[PDB]
Amino acid sequence: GADDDAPSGEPDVTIRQEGDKTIQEYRVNGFLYAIKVVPKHGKPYFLVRADGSDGNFIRSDQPDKLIPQWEIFSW
Amino acid sequence: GADDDAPSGEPDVTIRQEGDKTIQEYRVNGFLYAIKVVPKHGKPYFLVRADGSDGNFIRSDQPDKLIPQWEIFSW
């Protein structure tokens, strides 16, 4: 009601919409750690930032697949 | 690489073994954003920190399910 103060480390999601895909930028402190895409023509999935700026992502629909640095922008 | 110069953020994974479970702490900037725990009894999976530091995670096992604290600390 009032004391819902957010402490140090606030993982808030930046919810934007590009055409017909809701791109949810999960940022805990400025830095993106996961992107939940909700494409109306591709189905919603979590794109998790693997450790290291290698350019690899992991999808919540298929953690068995490693997303290369060209497929990361499939949306 | 040879030399490194990481920008404000620096996401890396601290891989420990807590008993019979290899718990990989994916920390970006002073906040755990994902845990990859490899339990000998339960099989490995990804546990992603959902928006809001309430205490809910999303698993790679099933992103269609919200994981509460009795379930996040199921190991």
What are the distances in angstroms from CA A48 to CA A8, B22, B37, B51?
22, 19, 15, 13
Q: Which amino acid is at A2?
A: A
Which value, in Å, is the radius of gyration of the alpha carbons in chain B?
A: 14
Q: Is B71 helix (H, G, I), strand (E, B) or coil?
A: helix
Q: Is B43 helix (H, G, I), strand (E, B) or coil?
A: coil
Q: Are A31 and A50 in contact (CB under 8 A)?
A: no
CATH number of B34's domain: 2.20.130.30
CA distance B62 to B40: 20
| Contact call for B34 and A30, based on CB within 8 A | no
Q: Searching chain B, which residue's CA lies closest to the CA of residue A7?
A: B53
Please give, rounded to a whole number of angstroms, the shortest distance from the CA of B42 to a CA of chain A.
16
In the block, residue with structure tokens 């402490």: A7
Q: Are B33 and B49 in contact (CB under 8 A)?
A: yes
Main-chain dihedrals φ then ψ at residue B72, nearest 5 degrees = -70, -35
Q: Pull the structure tokens for residue B13.
A: 């994974």
List the determination method: NMR
| Contact call for A30 and B51, based on CB within 8 A | no
Q: How many domains does chain B have?
A: 1
B13 DSSP β-pair partners: B26
Please name the helix (run of DSSP H) or strand (run of DSSP E) that holds residue B56, with its range, or none: none
Domain of residue B51 covers 1-75
| Contact call for A26 and B51, based on CB within 8 A | yes
